[PDB]
């Protein structure tokens, strides 16, 4: 029962906690050598039973084997490899398109599989300079898609599942794609992608949207120019581009520091238009979504960049305007009125960042989908949970019910309470993937669908409840 036959050959998995797991399955040919910076290609078939008991290496990233360009692998968890057509949850990890992997223990699919009788798939996709180096036409038409290779890898993994998941006990016609932060931005992009249309039935976006980390061609090209200089690669020198060692190319890129931000590029080749705008044109009509945000998420960014908490009010405001401005005066007045008397100054203003980077994107996405007539379920995660990371969503452990897993901010205190919230989110996510509706007795009260009329959203906290148009006042302040 551990051996499964796919279109490319047989795979041997292993038993774990009562469920079956297959690790390190290649979903595309290794993008090394002459295949570097090129779209993903179908993996080569093999004879015999390939071992799928160990995770494959993770993609190149700043550093269990060592990171490698040969990291296009996926992992599968299932109650049993049969023909029960179970819902399929396809996870796209976050990490600012810079680091991370589907093999990280906090994404272990055992709980979802065991508690919901669903199949779970987690993947790796090319990141940073290997997956998002926008070359444009600088090195020829063959590399015109280099700026979005990470997205293309995700699509290639999705096609592999659509084509082979049935053998692992999953239903190819009931795939729900979900992700957090950069992973949610990836979901947002795929929702708008013609090439991915029909590959999945539903989507869930946790603290992210198609606008998160999205770059314009001009912006992306400017970054590429700096990277190539640091790497000693002359524009148009395909030879050096392909022979430079992976570690050296990665070091060159990282030396630019957190100034360089990776992400999808509306390059007119892979992404023809803004991911959210596309939704307005029906790119994802008929695709239900569950979407939400982590309360005051940008505060978490000050942990990685303390500079925000050491700027004068005027000096802080200017930095915000530079990054997400222009900020209308109506908005400023709103934030001064809602400020917390006991909280430091920067916390008042950083709320502008939380809104522009996370809330607006979610609201635009929900409004676009609702306008198309598709069901939308919106939420705000308020539970205060403890904490070196690039992205800062906080729902993950509760959604995956991986509170035990190592690496997780597992600290003493409120065990029963942490369990209650997990039992609410875990099962609501399972219900959405199963039937397109997160409702059930696992929720203290009904979670109404998001409509322009009521704009209802579920609030997950120690005492979860429904709130009508909670972002209303704030939105009005800007619009």
From TrEMBL:
Top-level class of the enzyme under EC nomenclature: hydrolase
Q: Which family does it belong to?
A: Belongs to the type-B carboxylesterase/lipase family.
Q: Which organism is it from?
A: Geobacillus stearothermophilus
Q: What is its EC number?
A: 3.1.1.-
Q: Which GO terms describe its molecular function?
A: hydrolase activity
**Which SUPFAM superfamilies does the annotation name?**
alpha/beta-Hydrolases (SSF53474)
Q: Which Pfam families match?
A: COesterase
Domain Carboxylesterase type B as annotated: residue spans: 2-462
Q: Domain of life of the organism in this record?
A: Bacteria
Q: What is this protein called?
A: Carboxylic ester hydrolase
Gene3D superfamilies the UniProt entry points to: alpha/beta hydrolase
Mind telling me which PROSITE patterns this protein's record contains? CARBOXYLESTERASE_B_1 (PS00122)
What keywords tag this UniProt record? Hydrolase
